[PDB]
Amino acid sequence: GNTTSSVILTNYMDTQYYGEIGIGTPPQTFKVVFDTGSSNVWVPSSKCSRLYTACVYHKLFDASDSSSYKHNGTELTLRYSTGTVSGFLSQDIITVGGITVTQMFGEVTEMPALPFMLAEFDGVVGMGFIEQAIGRVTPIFDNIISQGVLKEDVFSFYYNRDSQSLGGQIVLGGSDPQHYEGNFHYINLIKTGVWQIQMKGVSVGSSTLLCEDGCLALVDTGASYISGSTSSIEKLMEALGAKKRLFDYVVKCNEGPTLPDISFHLGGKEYTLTSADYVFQESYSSKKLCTLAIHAMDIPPPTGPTWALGATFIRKFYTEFDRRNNRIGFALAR
Numbered sequence: 189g190n191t192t193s194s195v196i197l198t199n200y201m202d203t204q205y206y207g208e209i210g211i212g213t214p215p216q217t218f219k220v221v222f223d224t225g226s227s228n229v230w231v232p233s234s235k236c237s238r239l240y241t242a243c244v245y246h247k248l249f250d251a252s253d254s255s256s257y258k259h260n261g262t263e264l265t266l267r268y269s270t271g272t273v274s275g276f277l278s279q280d281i282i283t284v285g286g287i288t289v290t291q292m293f294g295e296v297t298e299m300p301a302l303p304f305m306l307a308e309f310d311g312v313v314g315m316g317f318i319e320q321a322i323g324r325v326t327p328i329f330d331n332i333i334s335q336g337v338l339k340e341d342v343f344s345f346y347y348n349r350d351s352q353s354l355g356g357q358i359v360l361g362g363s364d365p366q367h368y369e370g371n372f373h374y375i376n377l378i379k380t381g382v383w384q385i386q387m388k389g390v391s392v393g394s395s396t397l398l399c400e401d402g403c404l405a406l407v408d409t410g411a412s413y414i415s416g417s418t419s420s421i422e423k424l425m426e427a428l429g430a431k432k433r434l435f436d437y438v439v440k441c442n443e444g445p446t447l448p449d450i451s452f453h454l455g456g457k458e459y460t461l462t463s464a465d466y467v468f469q470e471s472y473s474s475k476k477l478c479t480l481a482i483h484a485m486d487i488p489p490p491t492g493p494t495w496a497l498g499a500t501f502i503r504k505f506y507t508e509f510d511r512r513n514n515r516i517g518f519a520l521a522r
Protein backbone atom coordinates (compact mmCIF):
# COMPACT_ATOMS: atom_id res chain seq x y z
CA GLY A 189 0.00 0.00 0.00
CA ASN A 190 2.74 2.45 -1.06
CA THR A 191 2.89 2.43 -4.89
CA THR A 192 2.05 5.54 -6.87
CA SER A 193 2.20 5.12 -10.62
CA SER A 194 1.61 7.24 -13.72
CA VAL A 195 0.28 6.80 -17.26
CA ILE A 196 1.73 9.16 -19.93
CA LEU A 197 -0.87 10.55 -22.39
CA THR A 198 -0.68 11.93 -25.93
CA ASN A 199 -2.73 15.02 -26.78
CA TYR A 200 -4.25 14.69 -30.27
CA MET A 201 -5.63 18.13 -31.27
CA ASP A 202 -7.05 18.88 -27.75
CA THR A 203 -9.83 16.35 -28.48
CA GLN A 204 -8.27 12.93 -27.92
CA TYR A 205 -6.20 12.06 -24.86
CA TYR A 206 -4.77 8.55 -24.83
CA GLY A 207 -2.12 6.45 -23.13
CA GLU A 208 -0.70 2.99 -23.80
CA ILE A 209 -1.53 -0.32 -22.15
CA GLY A 210 -0.26 -3.86 -22.77
CA ILE A 211 -2.57 -6.90 -23.06
CA GLY A 212 -1.40 -10.53 -22.96
CA THR A 213 1.83 -12.51 -22.92
CA PRO A 214 3.83 -11.21 -24.62
CA PRO A 215 2.30 -7.69 -24.20
CA GLN A 216 0.28 -6.44 -27.16
CA THR A 217 0.17 -2.62 -27.01
CA PHE A 218 -2.98 -0.52 -27.41
CA LYS A 219 -3.65 3.23 -27.53
CA VAL A 220 -6.53 3.66 -25.06
CA VAL A 221 -8.75 6.43 -23.68
CA PHE A 222 -9.15 6.53 -19.90
CA ASP A 223 -12.81 7.31 -19.39
CA THR A 224 -14.54 8.15 -16.10
CA GLY A 225 -17.87 8.17 -17.97
CA SER A 226 -17.90 4.39 -18.52
CA SER A 227 -16.54 1.23 -16.82
CA ASN A 228 -15.69 -1.49 -19.37
CA VAL A 229 -12.29 -2.27 -20.89
CA TRP A 230 -12.36 -2.92 -24.64
CA VAL A 231 -9.93 -3.01 -27.53
CA PRO A 232 -10.59 -4.18 -31.12
CA SER A 233 -10.40 -7.94 -31.70
CA SER A 234 -8.49 -9.95 -34.31
CA LYS A 235 -11.92 -11.57 -34.74
CA CYS A 236 -13.38 -8.28 -36.08
CA SER A 237 -14.58 -8.62 -39.68
CA ARG A 238 -12.20 -6.77 -41.97
CA LEU A 239 -15.26 -5.13 -43.61
CA TYR A 240 -15.24 -2.91 -40.53
CA THR A 241 -12.55 -0.48 -41.78
CA ALA A 242 -11.96 0.70 -38.18
CA CYS A 243 -10.53 -2.79 -37.62
CA VAL A 244 -8.30 -2.46 -40.71
CA TYR A 245 -6.86 0.78 -39.27
CA HIS A 246 -6.58 -0.02 -35.54
CA LYS A 247 -4.52 -2.41 -33.46
CA LEU A 248 -6.28 -5.76 -32.87
CA PHE A 249 -5.93 -8.10 -29.90
CA ASP A 250 -5.01 -11.54 -31.13
CA ALA A 251 -5.96 -14.02 -28.40
CA SER A 252 -4.06 -16.68 -30.42
CA ASP A 253 -0.77 -14.87 -29.72
CA SER A 254 -1.32 -14.68 -25.95
CA SER A 255 -0.38 -17.53 -23.59
CA SER A 256 -2.13 -15.84 -20.65
CA TYR A 257 -5.49 -15.50 -22.46
CA LYS A 258 -8.58 -17.04 -20.82
CA HIS A 259 -11.78 -17.58 -22.84
CA ASN A 260 -15.18 -16.39 -21.68
CA GLY A 261 -16.99 -15.41 -24.88
CA THR A 262 -20.14 -13.79 -23.46
CA GLU A 263 -21.50 -11.32 -26.04
CA LEU A 264 -21.53 -7.68 -24.96
CA THR A 265 -22.66 -4.40 -26.54
CA LEU A 266 -21.31 -1.08 -25.25
CA ARG A 267 -23.52 1.89 -26.19
CA TYR A 268 -21.87 5.30 -25.92
CA SER A 269 -23.18 8.78 -26.75
CA THR A 270 -21.12 8.96 -29.95
CA GLY A 271 -21.36 5.33 -31.13
CA THR A 272 -21.69 1.65 -30.30
CA VAL A 273 -19.15 -1.16 -30.13
CA SER A 274 -20.06 -4.83 -30.02
CA GLY A 275 -18.11 -7.99 -29.19
CA PHE A 276 -17.45 -10.64 -26.54
CA LEU A 277 -15.72 -10.90 -23.15
CA SER A 278 -12.22 -12.24 -22.62
CA GLN A 279 -9.68 -12.42 -19.81
CA ASP A 280 -5.97 -11.65 -19.89
CA ILE A 281 -3.14 -9.80 -18.13
CA ILE A 282 -3.32 -6.03 -18.68
CA THR A 283 -0.28 -3.83 -17.90
CA VAL A 284 -1.05 -0.19 -17.03
CA GLY A 285 1.59 2.23 -15.66
CA GLY A 286 3.84 -0.58 -14.43
CA ILE A 287 0.86 -2.24 -12.71
CA THR A 288 -0.21 -5.71 -13.86
CA VAL A 289 -3.77 -7.01 -13.37
CA THR A 290 -5.89 -9.97 -14.51
CA GLN A 291 -8.67 -8.11 -16.31
CA MET A 292 -11.91 -9.10 -18.01
CA PHE A 293 -12.30 -7.02 -21.19
CA GLY A 294 -14.34 -6.85 -24.41
CA GLU A 295 -12.84 -8.02 -27.66
CA VAL A 296 -14.73 -5.74 -30.05
CA THR A 297 -15.78 -7.51 -33.25
CA GLU A 298 -18.14 -4.82 -34.54
CA MET A 299 -16.69 -1.35 -34.82
CA PRO A 300 -18.55 1.28 -36.97
CA ALA A 301 -16.52 3.54 -39.28
CA LEU A 302 -18.26 6.57 -37.85
CA PRO A 303 -16.95 7.46 -35.38
CA PHE A 304 -14.04 5.02 -34.83
CA MET A 305 -12.24 5.78 -38.11
CA LEU A 306 -11.85 9.23 -36.51
CA ALA A 307 -10.23 7.77 -33.38
CA GLU A 308 -6.46 8.05 -32.96
CA PHE A 309 -6.89 5.55 -30.05
CA ASP A 310 -7.70 1.82 -30.42
CA GLY A 311 -9.91 1.22 -27.37
CA VAL A 312 -11.23 2.37 -24.00
CA VAL A 313 -10.35 1.77 -20.34
CA GLY A 314 -13.42 2.61 -18.26
CA MET A 315 -12.49 4.49 -15.06
CA GLY A 316 -16.05 4.44 -13.67
CA PHE A 317 -17.80 2.22 -11.12
CA ILE A 318 -19.04 -1.40 -11.26
CA GLU A 319 -22.71 -0.21 -11.12
CA GLN A 320 -22.46 1.08 -14.75
CA ALA A 321 -20.24 -1.75 -16.07
CA ILE A 322 -22.13 -3.69 -18.75
CA GLY A 323 -22.20 -7.37 -17.72
CA ARG A 324 -21.31 -6.50 -14.07
CA VAL A 325 -17.61 -6.95 -15.07
CA THR A 326 -15.19 -5.76 -12.34
CA PRO A 327 -13.59 -2.53 -13.64
CA ILE A 328 -9.80 -2.22 -13.90
CA PHE A 329 -9.33 0.29 -11.02
CA ASP A 330 -11.28 -1.97 -8.63
CA ASN A 331 -8.86 -4.78 -9.61
CA ILE A 332 -5.82 -2.55 -8.97
CA ILE A 333 -7.36 -1.57 -5.57
CA SER A 334 -7.81 -5.29 -4.76
CA GLN A 335 -4.02 -5.84 -5.01
CA GLY A 336 -3.41 -3.48 -2.04
CA VAL A 337 -0.49 -1.97 -3.96
CA LEU A 338 -1.62 1.69 -4.34
CA LYS A 339 -1.13 4.42 -1.68
CA GLU A 340 -4.88 5.35 -1.86
CA ASP A 341 -8.14 4.67 -3.78
CA VAL A 342 -7.55 7.82 -5.80
CA PHE A 343 -6.68 8.57 -9.40
CA SER A 344 -5.99 11.96 -11.01
CA PHE A 345 -6.10 13.48 -14.50
CA TYR A 346 -4.00 16.16 -16.10
CA TYR A 347 -4.80 17.20 -19.67
CA ASN A 348 -2.29 19.46 -21.39
CA ARG A 349 -3.27 22.68 -23.22
CA ASP A 350 -0.41 22.13 -25.66
CA SER A 351 -1.02 19.55 -28.39
CA GLN A 352 5.97 18.42 -28.59
CA SER A 353 5.90 17.80 -24.79
CA LEU A 354 3.84 15.89 -22.14
CA GLY A 355 0.32 15.57 -23.59
CA GLY A 356 -1.33 14.56 -20.32
CA GLN A 357 -1.00 12.44 -17.19
CA ILE A 358 -2.93 9.96 -15.03
CA VAL A 359 -1.63 9.26 -11.54
CA LEU A 360 -2.88 5.95 -10.15
CA GLY A 361 -2.95 6.14 -6.35
CA GLY A 362 -2.55 9.90 -5.84
CA SER A 363 -1.97 13.19 -7.65
CA ASP A 364 1.02 15.11 -9.02
CA PRO A 365 1.79 18.60 -7.56
CA GLN A 366 3.88 19.44 -10.70
CA HIS A 367 0.61 19.80 -12.68
CA TYR A 368 -1.76 21.63 -10.29
CA GLU A 369 -1.60 24.61 -7.91
CA GLY A 370 -3.43 26.15 -4.94
CA ASN A 371 -5.86 24.01 -2.94
CA PHE A 372 -8.18 21.24 -4.08
CA HIS A 373 -11.91 21.99 -3.83
CA TYR A 374 -13.69 18.75 -2.96
CA ILE A 375 -17.24 17.97 -4.17
CA ASN A 376 -19.19 14.85 -3.06
CA LEU A 377 -20.96 12.71 -5.65
CA ILE A 378 -24.79 12.57 -5.95
CA LYS A 379 -24.47 8.81 -5.45
CA THR A 380 -21.76 6.16 -5.51
CA GLY A 381 -21.81 4.31 -8.84
CA VAL A 382 -21.37 7.32 -11.17
CA TRP A 383 -18.73 10.13 -11.27
CA GLN A 384 -21.52 12.72 -11.12
CA ILE A 385 -21.98 15.83 -8.98
CA GLN A 386 -24.68 18.46 -8.33
CA MET A 387 -24.46 21.60 -10.50
CA LYS A 388 -26.23 24.66 -9.10
CA GLY A 389 -26.10 26.91 -12.23
CA VAL A 390 -24.57 27.72 -15.63
CA SER A 391 -23.63 31.35 -16.33
CA VAL A 392 -22.91 33.31 -19.50
CA GLY A 393 -20.88 36.33 -18.36
CA SER A 394 -22.61 36.75 -14.99
CA SER A 395 -26.25 35.94 -15.90
CA THR A 396 -27.29 32.46 -14.70
CA LEU A 397 -29.29 31.44 -17.78
CA LEU A 398 -29.24 27.67 -17.15
CA CYS A 399 -29.62 25.14 -14.28
CA GLU A 400 -31.46 27.85 -12.30
CA ASP A 401 -32.86 25.23 -9.90
CA GLY A 402 -29.98 22.76 -10.17
CA CYS A 403 -28.97 19.97 -12.55
CA LEU A 404 -26.44 17.15 -13.07
CA ALA A 405 -22.80 17.27 -14.19
CA LEU A 406 -20.93 14.13 -15.14
CA VAL A 407 -17.15 14.56 -14.73
CA ASP A 408 -16.13 12.80 -17.90
CA THR A 409 -12.52 12.22 -18.95
CA GLY A 410 -13.53 10.33 -22.12
CA ALA A 411 -15.52 13.31 -23.43
CA SER A 412 -13.78 15.89 -25.69
CA TYR A 413 -16.03 18.86 -25.09
CA ILE A 414 -18.30 20.30 -22.44
CA SER A 415 -21.82 19.04 -23.19
CA GLY A 416 -25.42 19.68 -22.11
CA SER A 417 -28.95 18.87 -23.39
CA THR A 418 -29.91 19.85 -26.94
CA SER A 419 -32.26 22.49 -25.44
CA SER A 420 -29.69 23.51 -22.78
CA ILE A 421 -26.95 24.01 -25.37
CA GLU A 422 -29.41 25.75 -27.74
CA LYS A 423 -30.09 28.41 -25.07
CA LEU A 424 -26.36 28.76 -24.24
CA MET A 425 -25.42 29.19 -27.90
CA GLU A 426 -28.18 31.70 -28.70
CA ALA A 427 -26.58 33.73 -25.88
CA LEU A 428 -23.05 33.42 -27.32
CA GLY A 429 -24.34 34.38 -30.81
CA ALA A 430 -23.12 31.03 -32.16
CA LYS A 431 -24.38 29.39 -35.40
CA LYS A 432 -25.44 25.72 -35.36
CA ARG A 433 -23.63 23.37 -37.68
CA LEU A 434 -24.37 19.64 -37.91
CA PHE A 435 -21.91 18.36 -35.22
CA ASP A 436 -20.83 21.54 -33.44
CA TYR A 437 -21.40 25.27 -33.03
CA VAL A 438 -19.27 27.87 -34.78
CA VAL A 439 -18.60 31.58 -34.48
CA LYS A 440 -16.89 33.89 -36.99
CA CYS A 441 -13.20 33.70 -35.92
CA ASN A 442 -12.97 37.46 -35.32
CA GLU A 443 -15.79 37.29 -32.75
CA GLY A 444 -13.95 34.57 -30.77
CA PRO A 445 -11.89 36.73 -28.36
CA THR A 446 -14.99 38.94 -27.74
CA LEU A 447 -17.07 35.95 -26.47
CA PRO A 448 -18.22 36.17 -22.80
CA ASP A 449 -17.07 33.97 -19.89
CA ILE A 450 -18.93 30.76 -19.07
CA SER A 451 -19.31 29.74 -15.42
CA PHE A 452 -20.25 26.45 -13.75
CA HIS A 453 -21.54 26.61 -10.17
CA LEU A 454 -20.16 23.44 -8.51
CA GLY A 455 -19.98 22.84 -4.72
CA GLY A 456 -20.45 26.54 -3.84
CA LYS A 457 -17.53 27.73 -6.03
CA GLU A 458 -17.84 29.35 -9.50
CA TYR A 459 -15.67 27.58 -12.16
CA THR A 460 -15.02 30.07 -14.95
CA LEU A 461 -14.03 29.53 -18.57
CA THR A 462 -12.82 32.42 -20.72
CA SER A 463 -13.28 32.29 -24.53
CA ALA A 464 -9.60 31.25 -24.71
CA ASP A 465 -10.64 28.04 -22.81
CA TYR A 466 -13.57 27.09 -25.11
CA VAL A 467 -12.82 28.49 -28.62
CA PHE A 468 -10.53 26.84 -31.16
CA GLN A 469 -8.84 30.08 -32.36
CA GLU A 470 -7.49 28.75 -35.69
CA SER A 471 -7.67 32.25 -37.22
CA TYR A 472 -8.81 35.84 -36.60
CA SER A 473 -10.40 36.27 -40.07
CA SER A 474 -13.99 37.55 -40.27
CA LYS A 475 -14.24 35.27 -43.35
CA LYS A 476 -13.21 32.10 -41.40
CA LEU A 477 -15.34 30.01 -39.03
CA CYS A 478 -14.04 28.90 -35.64
CA THR A 479 -15.45 25.94 -33.71
CA LEU A 480 -16.40 25.80 -29.99
CA ALA A 481 -15.39 23.12 -27.47
CA ILE A 482 -18.99 22.87 -26.18
CA HIS A 483 -21.71 20.83 -27.92
CA ALA A 484 -25.11 19.13 -27.47
CA MET A 485 -25.08 15.56 -26.12
CA ASP A 486 -28.20 13.85 -24.79
CA ILE A 487 -27.32 11.10 -22.35
CA PRO A 488 -30.32 8.78 -21.66
CA PRO A 489 -31.72 7.94 -18.14
CA PRO A 490 -30.84 7.27 -15.47
CA THR A 491 -27.46 9.04 -16.07
CA GLY A 492 -29.25 11.72 -18.13
CA PRO A 493 -30.28 14.27 -18.94
CA THR A 494 -26.91 15.53 -17.64
CA TRP A 495 -24.03 17.87 -18.44
CA ALA A 496 -20.65 16.32 -19.24
CA LEU A 497 -17.39 18.01 -18.23
CA GLY A 498 -14.79 16.72 -20.71
CA ALA A 499 -11.32 17.79 -21.88
CA THR A 500 -12.41 21.46 -22.23
CA PHE A 501 -13.02 21.61 -18.45
CA ILE A 502 -10.24 19.23 -17.29
CA ARG A 503 -7.58 21.23 -19.17
CA LYS A 504 -8.18 24.16 -16.80
CA PHE A 505 -8.91 22.06 -13.69
CA TYR A 506 -6.73 19.21 -12.54
CA THR A 507 -9.12 16.51 -11.33
CA GLU A 508 -8.68 13.97 -8.52
CA PHE A 509 -11.15 11.08 -8.42
CA ASP A 510 -11.62 9.75 -4.88
CA ARG A 511 -12.91 6.17 -4.53
CA ARG A 512 -12.33 6.11 -0.74
CA ASN A 513 -14.51 9.18 -0.04
CA ASN A 514 -16.81 9.23 -3.15
CA ARG A 515 -15.80 12.78 -4.08
CA ILE A 516 -14.05 14.77 -6.79
CA GLY A 517 -11.32 17.35 -6.16
CA PHE A 518 -10.65 20.20 -8.57
CA ALA A 519 -7.47 22.27 -8.55
CA LEU A 520 -6.03 24.90 -10.93
CA ALA A 521 -4.05 23.00 -13.58
CA ARG A 522 -0.57 24.10 -14.64
Ligand SMILES: Cc1ccc(C(=O)N2CCCCCC2)c(NCc2ccco2)n1
Pocket residue numbers: 203204205206221223225226268269270303304306307308312409410411412498499
Ligand atom coordinates in the same frame (compact mmCIF):
# COMPACT_ATOMS: atom_id res chain seq x y z
C1 LIG B 1 -13.35 10.15 -32.32
C2 LIG B 1 -13.90 9.92 -30.94
C3 LIG B 1 -14.95 9.02 -30.76
C4 LIG B 1 -15.45 8.82 -29.48
C5 LIG B 1 -14.87 9.53 -28.39
C6 LIG B 1 -15.37 9.36 -27.00
O1 LIG B 1 -16.14 10.22 -26.60
N1 LIG B 1 -15.00 8.32 -26.18
C7 LIG B 1 -14.08 7.25 -26.65
C8 LIG B 1 -14.83 6.11 -27.39
C9 LIG B 1 -15.86 5.40 -26.53
C10 LIG B 1 -16.85 6.39 -25.92
C11 LIG B 1 -16.46 6.99 -24.62
C12 LIG B 1 -15.56 8.24 -24.83
C13 LIG B 1 -13.81 10.44 -28.65
N2 LIG B 1 -13.22 11.16 -27.61
C14 LIG B 1 -11.80 10.97 -27.28
C15 LIG B 1 -11.36 11.55 -25.96
C16 LIG B 1 -10.31 11.13 -25.24
C17 LIG B 1 -10.23 11.94 -24.08
C18 LIG B 1 -11.25 12.81 -24.16
O2 LIG B 1 -11.92 12.58 -25.30
N3 LIG B 1 -13.38 10.58 -29.92
Ligand SMILES: *[C@@H]1O[C@H](CO)[C@@H](O)[C@H](O)[C@H]1NC(C)=O
Pocket residue numbers: 259260261262
Ligand atom coordinates in the same frame (compact mmCIF):
# COMPACT_ATOMS: atom_id res chain seq x y z
C1 LIG C 1 -18.04 -16.13 -18.24
O1 LIG C 1 -17.99 -15.43 -16.97
C2 LIG C 1 -19.11 -15.68 -16.10
C3 LIG C 1 -19.08 -14.74 -14.89
O2 LIG C 1 -17.90 -14.94 -14.10
C4 LIG C 1 -19.17 -17.17 -15.72
O3 LIG C 1 -20.32 -17.48 -14.92
C5 LIG C 1 -19.17 -18.04 -16.99
O4 LIG C 1 -19.02 -19.42 -16.65
C6 LIG C 1 -18.07 -17.65 -17.99
N1 LIG C 1 -18.26 -18.44 -19.21
C7 LIG C 1 -17.29 -19.15 -19.81
C8 LIG C 1 -17.73 -19.90 -21.03
O5 LIG C 1 -16.13 -19.19 -19.42
